[PDB]
Every structure is written in structure tokens, then in C-alpha cells.
Structure 1
Amino acid sequence: IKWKFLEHKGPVFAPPYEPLPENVKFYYDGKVMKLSPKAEEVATFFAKMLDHEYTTKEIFRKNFFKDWRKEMTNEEKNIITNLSKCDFTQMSQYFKAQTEARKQMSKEEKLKIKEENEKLLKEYGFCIMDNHKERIANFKIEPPGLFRGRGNHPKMGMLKRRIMPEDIIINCSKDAKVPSPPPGHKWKEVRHDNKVTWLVSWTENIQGSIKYIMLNPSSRIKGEKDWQKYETARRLKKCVDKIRNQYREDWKSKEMKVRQRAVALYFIDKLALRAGNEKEEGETADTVGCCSLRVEHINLHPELDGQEYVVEFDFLGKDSIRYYNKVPVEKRVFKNLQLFMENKQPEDDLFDRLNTGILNKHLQDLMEGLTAKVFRTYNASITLQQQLKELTAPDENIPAKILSYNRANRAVAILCNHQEKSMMNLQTKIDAKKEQLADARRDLKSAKADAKVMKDAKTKKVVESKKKAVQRLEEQLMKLEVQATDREENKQIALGTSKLNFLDPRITVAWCKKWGVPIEKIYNKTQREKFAWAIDMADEDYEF
């Protein structure tokens, strides 16, 4: 049970389509064409992505054109037979014009819309869950557009229809004021289910999946489950040795389904690979996980680049982000891999006889609610602890220590597989300070020089101030030099996500406090708000 009471206003529905200006033409074969509304609209979607590689892709265009046709009248259908003959140059230019316009418009325009946004947020961004007014994450309904699937996505480009009240299921308490659908509309169903956390939902027409409107991370419900998310991790931390020495003895099992299991778990532990749930054929870009590694995903090298018993991984993961790695592995694992690989086609799954369900079934058997995913949280978290505990120079300055935090962070966004000429502007700027600082130092030189002979005071104070100047510059300078060393070290690293989902805020908080570092120099309004729990309840001496 997630609540007893729940009341919201519903979702902001996407705004009505605004027909193009009369002077905004479209053509098919150089022939100006007036498009029916539903068709004009769909064309505008493509028009707004014209300067995006998406529009150059086959699948993208194939999918787009077909669904577009579907929104065509019989006449237009008879006419517009191919996308290549269409010309959105005018439409695209417009929209681009419109954008520059926003980008430059009256500040008067700016404040007025932010207000427009704020009230809207005041009116729809909240719900009342139980005894408190809570905040909604995704309150605005997904606008109709074109499906942008990651990777070589088969259905990329299809049209996402315009969601209607009649597509919307509303969830709330039997005792709540039921949001009134828009004038002239009805909901799909008004349900009261207190076992779920979502307030609204509908089914998406492209992958037939359910989309829900849930609460902001800052919610008691969210943050609660989040506090629990790290706990279990700490709990696994407690039983890891066992588990390790458990799956390792399973490598020797008399049953291959088991050996597969323990080995899968080995990679998930060691490598941080994800569970690897079987995906539905054709709905998305082919990607694989630990459990779904087709033999073609691994290569075994008795000896490689020096190390022995190497397992090379080369496959795409969630979002098609590539995974390449050569891992010297345990002898028993190497040897269990060949066996899992014998008499198999490349396309055959490495751990057939094994599944995500089995895996987690076994895990929760070892520790309550211990799932494949937990391993990643544990590994990440405990790493930030050690790394910080390791990189943080006791006698550094806030700036540098911040660099130390970041450094620690990378080591973490790195295992989790999270993935220019900026240096030209910096270094020049650095040089400025170095020279300013230099010349200022020249000032103190004399300042202190005048001081030897005039031990008065007026003099001594001038030295006092010339010194402050040196200090401020060295300051600015140190900062600069840091940004630099930072930027470089962080070329391909993605820390925003590790920071948002795999790292116990408490560790950070615990750090910031001990090191006298303001959380504000490490989290954004957003992160602080989400991690409000941790912040408030974290001892300087928190140990994960």
C-alpha cells in the first residue's frame, strides 16, 4: 500500500495545433501545396528536425513517411507518394526564425512566460498524497511528435499520436476530488488503486507500453524508496564475501544452469554488467546484457596483451552505448565460458538455461530483495567512499577538494560505463592571471620594499592590501588551473547520472561536512532537493 489519500488535478494536455502562416509554403515537386491540418502538423514535426541527422536516416524516413500518409486525406494520398519530393525548407526556416525570435525577444516577453510557466506549475505540478502536498515529476502530457529511438532503432520516426483525455487513466483515492476532463471530453477510466505510486497513465502507441505521471524525486514516496535503495546495498555489502565465495563454488557445480548463473553474477559483480533482460524482438535496437550475451559478444584469449584468461567483451548496452573490454578472468570462469560457448552459433545466447528471473530468484534467496541491480549501487557507492577517502588531500583548498570529489566521481561513472577546444580559452585566461598575479607580486615587492625604510603604518597597511591582492589572484588562478585539469580528465566521462542514481548522497554529504565543503558547490538545486533526506540526516562520520 502506497497511500490512503491521493488527489491531483490531472495532466497538462499538449496545446492545440496552430496552423502555419499563410506565407509559409510547402511543396511536392516544386508545387506549392496546401496541407490539411492533421497532415500539416505531422509535416511540421519533420520540418523541425530537418537539421538533425535523424532526417537523413532510412528507417527514420521510411517510418515517418508511412505514418504521415496515414494522416493524409485520399486526395493528398494520391499526390504525396514520396518523401524525397517534399520540401520543408520554408517550414523549417520559419520555425528556425521563430526560435531566434524567442532567443532574442523582449525581456518583457521572458518574465511574462516564466510567470505563465510558474502558475501552471502551481496549478498542475502538485498533488496531495496522504497528508501532504507533494510535487509531480512529469505533469505535462507528451506532445505528439516523432519517435526518437536510441541506436539503430527499427521504429524510430514513427509518429507519436496526440494523447487524449480518453487515453488517460486517472488514479486517485475514492475520497478525492476527481479532476474534471477538459470541456467536451472524458477520461478513459478513473481508478483508485493505492497499491501503485502513479497518478496518471496511458498506453503509448509505438511500443504499446504504459506511460505514467509520477512524483518528483523530492517526494516522500520517492526519496523513501531511495533511502531503501542504498540500505540494501549496504546490506549486500555485509553479505558480499559470502555471496562471492558462494557463486565461486557454484562454478564447480554439477549443473550448467548453475555454473551459468554464478558466472553471470561474476560479471555483474566484477564488471557491473546489467541483468540483461530478454528484449522483445523488433521493438527496439538490438542491445544485450549479462544474461543476454550472445556468444558473438565475447571472445576468449588464453593469453592476451600479456595477461592470461582474458574475456573480451564487445556488445552494445542500454541506449546502444558500446561495451568493449578485455578482462583477465578467474581460471574456472574462463574454463566455464568455453563450455558455455561450445557447439553454439555466434547468435546463440551464452547463458542459455539461465535467466534474469532465475538469477534474481537466487539472489533474493541469499539476501532479501537482493537484485542484480543492487550490485551496481554497492560497487559504485563503496567506490566513491574509498576513492574520496583516497584522493581528498587533507590540506587542500575547497576548489581542489572539489576536483578531488570529481576525480572520485569518475572512477564511479567509469565502472558504471557512463559515456573540446575549450582549453584554448582557459589556458589563455590562465596566462592572464599568471601574469596579472606576477605583476601584482611586483607591487608587493616594492610595497614590502617601501616598508623596510618606513616602518610607519600607512606603509605597513599598503603591504597588507598588496598582499590581499596577491592572494585573491592566486585564488582566481588556482581555480582556473583546476577547471582546466578538470575538463581534460573529464572528456568522455558522464557523471550526472552516477551522481543521480548510483551514489549514496550520504557519502557526499558526509564528505562536504568533514571537509567543510558546502553542498552547494557539489549539487544542483535539483540534486539537493532530491537528496534533502540524506542532507538533513547525514553525520560527518557517515560510513557506507
Structure 2
Amino acid sequence: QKWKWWEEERYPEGIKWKFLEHKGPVFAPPYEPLPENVKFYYDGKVMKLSPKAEEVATFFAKMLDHEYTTKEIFRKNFFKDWRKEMTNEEKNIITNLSKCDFTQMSQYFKAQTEARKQMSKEEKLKIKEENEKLLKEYGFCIMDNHKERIANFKIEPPGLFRGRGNHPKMGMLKRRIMPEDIIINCSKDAKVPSPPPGHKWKEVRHDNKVTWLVSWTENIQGSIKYIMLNPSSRIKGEKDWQKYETARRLKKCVDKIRNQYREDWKSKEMKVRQRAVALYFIDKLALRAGNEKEEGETADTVGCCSLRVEHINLHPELDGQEYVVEFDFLGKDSIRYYNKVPVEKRVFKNLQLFMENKQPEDDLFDRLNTGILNKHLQDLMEGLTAKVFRTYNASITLQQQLKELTAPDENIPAKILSYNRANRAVAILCNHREENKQIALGTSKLNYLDPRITVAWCKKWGVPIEKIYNKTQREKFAWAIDMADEDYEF
């Protein structure tokens, strides 16, 4: 695009844009039923069904091999939801799926698959370019003065909700979204997308006070979904860009913050103590915010504020160190955070205190929620919040690595390796193909450390950026690049 949105004036806050024009979504391609050859079964009794139930069944059919289907709770979710998706008659006869047979059905898809994985170059070629056609008329809205790419115009297809970890809602059917379920976000003056024949939109408005050009509420969690622009997009960028500016600022105004909490460790007001600790933890252990979740529709996962007592154990001496806090619990997406970390005596003793008289199920930091934690932070700094920190130490600890593990004389190839070695040290705290076959890729890089840093480093040493950042990822940082000099210090 060669667009330099940053080189352009600052938006008057709240206001996201002046102009916006998009062609609406791309509704999921409708269900084409199974041909007579391919059929169902149930007690051997090969019997056809309602198209609705059919498609629904297919879902299950396409995951029998998958452990989800082997998951009990998941199954209940299926069975029940399915019933609803079919006729009384059927509903009557299939009193038991634990007698059904999707095997045949599985086969077809796998077949159709291998078939597709056998389709002619020319045959497919048509579709390839054909599919490309779609984008041009469906993948680029029109905002303010430029044509940017959208995240995804293709609406989330109906299906079977896959829930990470022991999600109590895993196995429930998603659903096929209709125009009647859609909300268009335009700009009264722009050419509003005309809803598909017969149908009407749910609602259409122009709140330029938001990002997304289109959205709807998912049924499962009854949560909202939205179609928003691309990362390379200004809108999606400036936030992220100024996102680092934030951490960039606590950076100074932090040592102070620390004193405060360490000092706060000796407070009289409980909550004040409870708070300080949490920060400390997050500070060091880089723990996440810890929002309170609805004990049911949620998949029980804790966080710094949302920590329960059972999640920790304290050892006054252990592994040679004193006042050790043993952390075990599953965070986001139920990813167990196990750790043995030595803390300040006061914390230890305070912790020891926070536990006093409580049940395992009792929240560790009772008299404390995320909201509070941030309210405090806010008064200490504008826009200060738990997130900021992870973002902080991340891009900062790194800032030193490429200062340390980097050799002046060193060759690029070497330098490169020298670089990667820096990032290792980074994820060394987040707890996040030979020596690595368990650690994730970008993740941190993906959105945790100020790229400006990587940039000025390439400059300060003459490293062809392309080496570390590909086009697509360089596209996202298409500014940090342009706007940066080896003399950059986050």
C-alpha cells in the first residue's frame, strides 16, 4: 500500500474514522446433503434423516476419530443439541446415539477429501483464481481514504464448538448465522451492502466510535463476534503502536511504583496488602490479569487476582532456597502454570496470612478483583493496567539481550542465531525442530515486544530486516520499520 498513516495526523480520540464502506459478509456456503450411496445406519438400520439433522450429524461424523468425540461431557452436549435439530419421528427413534453409526459418513468425507487431494491442477486452478476473485470484491472495505484488507469476510460456519480444556460447553452445536442475525457498521453516505435476496439485516448503524465493520452475537457463550480490519491497517496498528508507547512510559514511572507496593506489604488495610502482592506476582511472574469467570458456562481457569488458595503451597526452605511459593494452576486455555518461586519474606508471610482460615476453594486474594487492581494502577498512571506489565518486561528484558549476547565483529548468519538466542531468555519467565518441539513460535513476538527494538538493532548492525521478519509480518510492522533508527531505545 505504501501508506504511512503514522506520518499522518492524530485522530481526535473515540473517533475511529470519517468514512467506511464494505460489501457485507460472506455467509457460510449452504449444506448440500449426502447422496443415497452415502447413508447413515443406527442399529444397522440404515435410515435417512432430516437435512438439518443430517448436516448436524455430519459434524460429529467429521470428528469420531478426534478425542473430543471420545470426551464424555462433550458427547452429552452433542446428543441433546442434536435432538433439537431434527423431527419428532427421528427424535423418537434415536433414543440412543450409543447405537448410531457415523463410520460410513466419516468415510465419505475422508474420501471426498483424498478426492479433493487428487483434484486436477487445472480443475482446482479454476477455483484457486475463482476464490481469489472473492477477495477483490469482498476483502477490502473503504475507510477514510484507503482500501485496506479485512480480517475475514467469511462468516463463522455453523458447527460444533470446540472448547479448550474441560469446557462445560464443549460439544454444543454452534449455528448458521443469518442476515437477520447481522449488524452492519457503515457510515451514512457510504454504499450500504444490500442484504441477500428475501432476507434483511438484523440492524445497521454507523458508530464511527468503533472498529468492526460487521458483527453478530455468537449463540454458545451468547457472546458478540465481529469482522474488523487487518493488522497492517492503520486502525488496527495505531492502537498496537501506541500500545507499546504505554509500556514505554511505565518504564520510567515504575521503580517508584515498585517501592509503593513493597512498602504496601506492611500496610494495615488487608486489601491494600492483597493488592500489592498480586502486583508483585504479576510484576515478576508476569501473571495475567485474572478476570472473574462465571462458574459454569466457563472453563475453570484462574489468574493472579482470580487465584484460589489450593493453587499454592508455601515452603520456608526448599530446593536450597527459603520462603518458596509453589505455583500450580491452569491459566488461559487451561494451560497449567507450575512453578517454584522464592519471594520476599513479607510476601511469603503475607501470603501465609492470606491463607489463614480459608478453604481450598476459597479465593486466595479475597477482598480483591481485577477491576480494583486496575483502578489502583490507573491512579498511579493513566491507562495503567495489569496487561501493560507483561508487555513491559517482555520488550525490555529483550532490549538488553541484543545488547549483551550480540557480538560487534559477528557475521550476519551468526548474528541471526545470536538474535534468536536473545528471545529464548525472554520467554524464560512467561513459562510459555530438535531441541525445540514443545515451545511455540512467535507468540511473544506475535504481539508482546516492541518491534521498533528489533528494527533499530537491525540498523545498528546492518541486518536485512527481511531475515527476521517476512513480508506478512513486516507488513504489520510497516511503520516501525520506516519510522526507526538504530538509535532507538524503547
Whether TM-score is above 0.5 comes out as yes
**Range with greater deviation from structure 2 (326-335 or 101-110):** 101-110
Q: Give me the whole-angstrom Cα distance separating, in 2, the residues matched to 1:148 and 1:23.
A: 30
Q: What whole-Å deviation, never above 9, does each CA across 1:201-260 have from its counterpart, x for those lacking one? A: 111110000011111111101110011110111101111101111111111111010111
Kindly indicate whether the alpha-carbon contact (under 8 Å) linking 1:149 and 1:284 is maintained by their aligned counterparts in 2.
no
Q: How far off is 1:289 after superposition?
A: 0.2
In 2: Cα distance, 1:518 partner to 1:104 partner: 40
CA contact (8 A) 1:128 1:134 kept: yes
Deviation for aligned residue 1:337 = 0.3
Do the aligned partners of 1:413 and 1:494 also contact (CA within 8 Å) in 2?
no
Q: Distance in 2 between matches of 1:491 and 1:401?
A: 23
1:161 is aligned to 2:175? yes
Deviations 1:54-110 (CA, angstroms, capped at 9, x unpaired): 111001111011111110101100111222211111111111112222223212133
CA contact (8 A) 1:236 1:367 kept: yes
Q: Distance in 1 between matches of 2:388 and 2:22?
A: 33
Q: Give a deviation string over 1:13-71, Cα, whole Å, max 9, x none.
A: 00011111221121111110111100110011111112211111001111011111110
CA distance in 2, matches of 1:495, 1:249: 39
RMSD value, Cα: 1.3
Q: Following the alignment from structure 2 to structure 1, what is the Cα–Cα distance between the partners of residues 257 and 489? A: 22
Cα shift at 1:274 = 0.3
1:436 maps to which residue?
none
1:514 CA displacement: 2.6
Cα deviations across residues 460-485 of structure 1 (Å, max 9, x unaligned)? Answer: xxxxxxxxxxxxxxxxxxxxxxxxxx
Q: Secondary structure at the match of 1:31?
A: coil
8 Å CA contact 1:510–1:542 kept in 2: the answer is yes
How far apart are the structure 2 equivalents of 1:391 and 1:83? Answer: 60
* Counterparts of 2:382 and 2:116, CA distance in 1: 53
- Mapped partners of 1:389, 1:140: distance in 2: 44
Tell me the SS of whatever aligns to 1:376: helix
Say whether the 8 Å CA contact 1:172–1:199 is kept in structure 2: yes
Q: Tell me, in whole angstroms, the C-alpha distance in 1 between the residues paired with 2:218 and 2:485.
A: 44
Aligned match for 1:210, one of 187, 212, 224: 224
1:383 aligns with 2:397: yes
CA contact (8 A) 1:9 1:124 kept: yes
State the TM-score, normalizing by the size of structure 1: 0.86
> 1:487-539: per-residue Cα shift (whole Å, max 9, x none)?
33433222321111101111111222333322222123321111111111121
The DSSP-based 3-state class of the residue aligned with 1:83 is: coil
SS at match of 1:334: helix
Structure 2 unaligned runs (5+)? Answer: 1-14
TM-score, scaled to structure 2: 0.95
1:309-356, Cα deviation, whole Å (9 max, x unpaired): 111100000011110001100011101101111010000011111111
> What SS class does the counterpart of residue 200 from structure 2 fall into?
coil
Is the deviation greater in 83-92 or in 407-416?
407-416
SS of residue in 2 equivalent to 1:292: coil
Would you say the 8 A contact 1:506–1:534 is kept in 2?
Answer: yes
CA contact (8 A) 1:410 1:493 kept: no
Q: Secondary structure at the match of 1:122?
A: helix
After TM superposition, give the deviation of residue 197 of structure 1 in Å: 0.7
SS at match of 1:132: coil
> What is the rounded CA distance, in whole Å, between the counterparts of 1:377 and 1:11 in structure 2?
33
SS of aligned partner of 2:443: helix
Please state whether the residue corresponding to 1:160 is helix, strand or coil.
coil
Q: How far apart are the structure 2 equivalents of 1:68 and 1:509?
A: 53
Deviation string 1:257-314 (CA, Å, 9 cap, x unpaired) is 0111110000010000001000112112110000000001111111111100111100
CA shift at 1:2, angstroms?
Answer: 1.2
Q: After the TM superposition, which of the residue ranges 521-530 and 326-335 deviates more from structure 2?
A: 521-530
Higher alpha-carbon deviation: 84-93 or 509-518: 509-518
Alpha-carbon distance change, 525 to 110 in structure 1, aligned in 2, over 3 angstroms: farther
CA distance in 2 between counterparts of 1:210 and 1:70 reads: 23
When you count helix as a share of all residues, which structure comes out higher? 1
- Looking at structure 2, the residues matched to 223 and 172 of structure 1 have their Cα atoms a distance apart, in angstroms, of 20
State whether residues 264 and 290 of structure 1, in contact with CA within 8 Å, keep that contact through their aligned partners in structure 2. yes
> Aligned with 1:211: secondary structure?
strand
Q: Per the alignment, do residues 339 and 37 of structure 1 end up closer, same or farther by CA in structure 2, a change over 3 Å counting? A: same
Q: Work out the CA distance in 1 between the residues paired with 2:140 and 2:429.
A: 37
CA-CA distance at 1:401 after TM superposition: 2.2
Name which one, 1 or 2, has greater alpha-carbon Rg.
1
